[PDB]
Amino acid sequence: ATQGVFTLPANTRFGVTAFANSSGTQTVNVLVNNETAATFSGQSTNNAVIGTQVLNSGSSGKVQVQVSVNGRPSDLVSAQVILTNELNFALVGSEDGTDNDYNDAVVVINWPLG
Amino acid sequence: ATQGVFTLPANTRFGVTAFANSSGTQTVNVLVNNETAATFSGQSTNNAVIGTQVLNSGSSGKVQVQVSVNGRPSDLVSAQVILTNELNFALVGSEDGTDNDYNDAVVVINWPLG
Amino acid sequence: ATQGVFTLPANTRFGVTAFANSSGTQTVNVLVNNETAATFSGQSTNNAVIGTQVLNSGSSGKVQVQVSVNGRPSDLVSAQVILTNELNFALVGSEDGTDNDYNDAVVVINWPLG
Amino acid sequence: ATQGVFTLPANTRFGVTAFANSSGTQTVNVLVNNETAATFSGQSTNNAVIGTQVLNSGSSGKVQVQVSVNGRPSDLVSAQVILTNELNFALVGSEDGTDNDYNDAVVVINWPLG
Ligand SMILES: C[C@@H]1O[C@@H](O)[C@@H](O)[C@H](O)[C@@H]1O
Ligand SMILES: C[C@@H]1O[C@@H](O)[C@@H](O)[C@H](O)[C@@H]1O
Ligand SMILES: C[C@@H]1O[C@@H](O)[C@@H](O)[C@H](O)[C@@H]1O
Ligand SMILES: C[C@@H]1O[C@@H](O)[C@@H](O)[C@H](O)[C@@H]1O
Ligand SMILES: [Ca+2]
Ligand SMILES: [Ca+2]
Ligand SMILES: [Ca+2]
Ligand SMILES: [Ca+2]
Ligand SMILES: [Ca+2]
Ligand SMILES: [Ca+2]
Ligand SMILES: [Ca+2]
Ligand SMILES: [Ca+2]
């Protein structure tokens, strides 16, 4: 099944934050309406924040997260959670190796803002 | 129901990160085994990452998030989600006012790390 | 925070199923647009299905679950999960007593159907 | 990533319920400790409950859901959600075709019972 793809409400501000937990340098790309809108890179084995940004979902609402490590695409897991019918989280983990911890880059998208 | 309380794997490092989306200055307290382990504060209406830290869940694994604004406890919502039977997120929203957006402080706990 | 309230896409069929795990008889009411659309009742300590139905979210999409036992509303917990950006679950637990198992009536809403 | 595999607490009763939404007859097999413990079959486009059953997770706690249509495995999605640090849902969707609604068989696992 496809993972890392989320439909947000149109024309809505959202936060996107990435963390790293791997020996490999993580490159996280965030696409809005199929065009790169943010890119983060960094290395950590201690959950460092490798980037944070606020984006707009635009007319389509389509947001996609991609992760690669030294040009190799990582396998993704994802889901969306809604609390009290208002607070949204889109969650992504990724695996760059063999241990299947799926934390090598972790991406959190949240909305609404403000 | 109680919210913002999570049983983590014992003796395990976890990430905790807080975001602010309110006119009010947020204060986030993270308790491990019923003792304060981290405190974050800030004021933003644009999802600022007012704190991020790595903690250990200790011998009991009990982690609790509390949020206040000008000394008043915020109302909390929370849940935990597990992806691919391994990757964990504990999620908290909070409301300091009357609009019920529940984003005024948002807290994400993630494990495993490394 | 409010629990057991979900906004579905408008005019969309959804399934609702309720389970019982309590000494007490559970009555589950499902409201669409703030009017009762289905009512289930039964008693089990073995997770019996006490009702299942397909409903239409209607023009507003506003669906609410309420649970009563022994003449008093139960305390509710809830969240919504979306898998592969397609498959939606709205989940409710309820507590009618003192043990805080929150399983006394369990309600699952799923969409889309067909 | 692997989907439809969950680790439950050992020696714990749990509920498993399957729904169908497809032209194809769904076959759902629930394995405990790698051995089939329940099987359900049926065709519906209207979310019929093709089976429900209470099982014990046994010494291993390992529970796996498999879905097929006339012997062809369906593609699975899954996640687990915990409410108020106590009430557990393991969720599975499956796709037998090309439309990626992932509802063709839907399986819900819930614990604790009683
Ligand atoms: C330090 C190690 O780096 C990579 O091999 C990751 O895939 C592992 O999960 C671990 O983080
Ligand atoms: C700017 C406003 O600040 C407070 O009133 C918050 O409770 C609102 O949600 C909003 O963020
Ligand atoms: C048999 C018992 O019945 C009620 O007291 C419930 O609140 C308990 O959770 C338990 O199910
Ligand atoms: C009636 C149709 O039957 C199969 O093709 C399913 O894969 C579709 O999702 C739809 O339910
Ligand atoms: Ca890894
Ligand atoms: Ca890792
Ligand atoms: Ca607010
Ligand atoms: Ca706010
Ligand atoms: Ca109870
Ligand atoms: Ca009970
Ligand atoms: Ca399908
Ligand atoms: Ca279908």
Side-chain angles (χ1 to χ4, degrees), chain C residues 7 12 14 26 30 60 67 75 78 85 87-88 92 104 106 108:
Chain C
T7 303
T12 299
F14 66 93
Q26 312 290 305
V30 185
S60 72
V67 180
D75 191 47
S78 58
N85 203 39
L87 177 66
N88 296 72
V92 182
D104 296 327
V106 172
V108 175

Side-chain angles (χ1 to χ4, degrees), chain C residues 113-114, chain D residues 21-22 95 99 101-104:
Chain C
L113 304 187
Chain D
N21 293 282
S22 175
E95 178 54 49
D99 68 349
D101 62 358
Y102 278 84
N103 72 359
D104 298 325

Side-chain angles (χ1 to χ4, degrees), chain A residues 1-3 5-8 78-85 88, chain C residues 1-3 5-8 62 78-85:
Chain A
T2 306
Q3 300 281 265
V5 175
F6 310 100
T7 300
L8 273 62
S78 61
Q80 181 183 343
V81 181
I82 313 181
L83 304 184
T84 192
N85 201 39
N88 293 68
Chain C
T2 296
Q3 302 279 267
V5 174
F6 309 105
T7 303
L8 275 62
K62 192 37 80 292
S78 58
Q80 178 183 341
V81 177
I82 312 180
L83 305 184
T84 193
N85 203 39

Side-chain angles (χ1 to χ4, degrees), chain A residues 113-114, chain B residues 21-24 44-45 95-104:
Chain A
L113 305 187
Chain B
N21 289 282
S22 175
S23 69
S44 171
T45 47
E95 177 57 48
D96 67 24
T98 56
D99 66 349
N100 297 329
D101 65 356
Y102 279 85
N103 73 357
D104 297 324

Side-chain angles (χ1 to χ4, degrees), chain B residues 7 16 23 29-30 36 41 47-48 68 71 76 78 93 103 109 111:
Chain B
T7 303
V16 59
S23 69
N29 286 296
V30 183
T36 299
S41 182
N47 213 48
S68 61
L76 305 183
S78 60
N103 73 357
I109 288 163
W111 74 92

